[PDB]
Amino acid sequence: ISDEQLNSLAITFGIVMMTLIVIYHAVDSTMSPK
Amino acid sequence: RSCVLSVFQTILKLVIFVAIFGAAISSRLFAVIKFESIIHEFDPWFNYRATKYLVN
Amino acid sequence: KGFSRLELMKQIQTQNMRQTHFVTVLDMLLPEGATDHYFTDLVGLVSTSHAER
């Protein structure tokens, strides 16, 4: 496996893990007491 | 309402841990798929010499 | 007398024969369609090897 595909797999897992945090914290901020 | 929101929190946390257990694994591996897979430096070649004694 | 490197560099520099008595390459013959070759070793993985037909 060339590390260009490993590079795209690395940033892809970074963005997919890093976007869902914000919608988790938005649901948990809007519809919860604290 | 409480069951719906609680199930949503649980499933979303499971998908979070499946992603963030994978981003680390994929970030460490440039020196293994670039080259062969061998122990790297001066100090980690005693430890490998001792856990190969215990193991047989 | 020993093993001198630069005299072997002088052999490699001016080459006219295959009449020498040490082995440098060797090639095994394979079955017809062979797919995923590798040439490892006892200390690692030697990386100077390429296939033919």
Side-chain angles (χ1 to χ4, degrees):
Chain A
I1 300 171
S2 297
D3 54 351
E4 297 294 324
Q5 296 179 358
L6 187 68
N7 195 5
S8 180
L9 199 278
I11 55 98
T12 296
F13 273 159
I15 291 173
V16 174
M17 69 169 271
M18 201 61 76
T19 299
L20 297 176
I21 299 297
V22 182
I23 57 98
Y24 181 81
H25 198 274
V27 172
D28 190 75
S29 68
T30 293
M31 295 192 287
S32 179
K34 188 178 290 294
Chain B
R1 283 89 172 94
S2 179
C3 65
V4 176
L5 189 64
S6 180
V7 166
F8 183 77
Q9 300 294 104
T10 298
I11 302 300
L12 177 63
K13 286 173 69 174
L14 265 293
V15 178
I16 286 296
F17 278 155
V18 171
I20 72 105
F21 187 76
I25 294 290
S26 72
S27 288
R28 313 300 168 97
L29 299 184
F30 293 103
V32 168
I33 62 99
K34 174 60 70 69
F35 288 153
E36 57 179 355
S37 70
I38 58 170
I39 316 294
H40 270 178
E41 292 176 354
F42 300 103
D43 285 329
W45 293 16
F46 187 70
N47 299 121
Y48 176 66
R49 181 179 180 274
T51 180
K52 195 174 71 181
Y53 184 81
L54 164 59
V55 84
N56 55 12
Chain C
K1 295 179 182 180
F3 169 65
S4 65
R5 187 77 191 185
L6 65 86
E7 197 275 338
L8 180 59
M9 286 181 182
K10 299 289 103 175
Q11 296 294 320
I12 286 173
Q13 184 58 254
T14 63
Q15 190 275 128
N16 290 315
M17 68 193 88
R18 293 182 183 174
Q19 296 294 109
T20 192
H21 58 280
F22 61 93
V23 54
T24 303
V25 303
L26 60 94
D27 50 346
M28 56 287 291
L29 193 144
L30 277 298
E32 293 182 354
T35 299
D36 288 333
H37 304 99
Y38 68 97
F39 169 60
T40 179
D41 199 353
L42 195 144
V43 86
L45 180 139
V46 189
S47 67
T48 169
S49 68
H50 67 280
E52 194 65 27
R53 63 185 70 186

